[PDB]
Design a protein around this ligand. Structure first.
Ligand SMILES: COc1cc(C(=O)N2CCC(N3CCN(C)CC3)CC2)ccc1Nc1ncc2c(n1)N(C)c1ccccc1C(=O)N2C
Length: 260
């Protein structure tokens, strides 16, 4: 249970995406997080990880290959996930939701400005430092959507169905940025209502159909105050070229509303 200087002291998370361990240097005591994969894909991931330098995105410290097992050393977010701050059926107080949303948007503006799309934004991947600062984590699905100032459209299916934008189920090719925006709106919904509005955004999904018919007397929308709900009406728009952009989210009334 050791890699060079570091003792791998406990299991922080697991999955087909390897596992994540708490790592404590015996010399220096600096604690970090290490992702361990039993090993194309990771080469890309590491590459993306090395571009990342922003306070709302998990830092990459470096990596080590040891035969089959790659170790990736990353910022430790000692407050865990946003998922665990969401109370089922209630959400969280609106001012915390707002602050987290602000921080999410800063993170996403940054990724997009370096031409990176995350592609799987959801509360499980939004981690908290010890002062409750939100960090966007897990770049195993991320990719480059802008290079030498030329945009490339995406075609791969990536994501988690309740968070995924409807164009991804319906279009041969799609712009990257409105996909991540959509998912941020699902996150905001989850934060304010403690429940996901649909299993996936298709027309065979009744709850999705009801939203498009504006039945906001139903759950989860009935739990959400009118100011953030109006912003949700701009984000969760089925046509991705009519959907609100981040610069325009920044001008939204609820976004700029002072709160407790
Ligand atoms: C000390 O920091 C963390 C604490 C917790 C957390 O509250 N728990 C609760 C108790 C849990 N169990 C211990 C074992 N026991 C049998 C059951 C209970 C261990 C983890 C969760 C995450 C923590 N920090 C952390 N930072 C960066 C990550 C990352 N996670 N992982 C797991 C990621 C998760 C999702 C997406 C990306 C990451 C990640 O890449 N990093 C770097």
């Amino acid at each position: 249970p050791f890699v060079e200087d570091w003792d791998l002291v406990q299991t922080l998370g697991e999955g087909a995406y390897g596992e994540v361990q708490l790592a404590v240097n015996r010399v220096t005591e600096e604690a970090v997080a290490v992702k361990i994969v039993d090993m194309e894909n990771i080469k890309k991931e590491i590459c993306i990880l090395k571009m990342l330098n922003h306070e709302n995105v998990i830092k990459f410290y470096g990596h080590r290959r040891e035969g089959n097992i790659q170790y990736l050393f990353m910022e430790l977010a000692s407050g865990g996930s946003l998922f665990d701050r969401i109370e089922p059926d209630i959400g969280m107080p609106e001012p915390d939701a707002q602050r987290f949303f602000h921080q999410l948007m800063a993170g996403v503006v940054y990724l997009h400005g370096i031409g990176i799309t995350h592609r799987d934004i959801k509360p499980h991947n939004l981690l908290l430092d010890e002062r409750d600062n939100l960090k966007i984590a897990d770049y195993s699905l991320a990719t480059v959507f802008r290079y030498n100032n030329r945009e490339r459209l995406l075609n791969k299916m990536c994501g988690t169905l309740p968070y995924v934008a409807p164009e991804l189920l319906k279009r041969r090719e799609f712009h990257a940025e409105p996909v991540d925006v959509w998912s941020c709106g699902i996150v905001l919904t989850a934060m304010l209502a403690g429940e996901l509005p649909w299993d996936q955004p298709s027309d065979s999904c009744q709850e999705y159909s009801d939203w498009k018919e504006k039945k906001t007397y139903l759950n989860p929308w009935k739990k959400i105050d009118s100011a953030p709900l109006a912003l949700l009406h701009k984000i969760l728009v089925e046509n991705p070229s009519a959907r609100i952009t981040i610069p325009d989210i920044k001008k939204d009334r609820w976004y700029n509303k002072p709160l407790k």
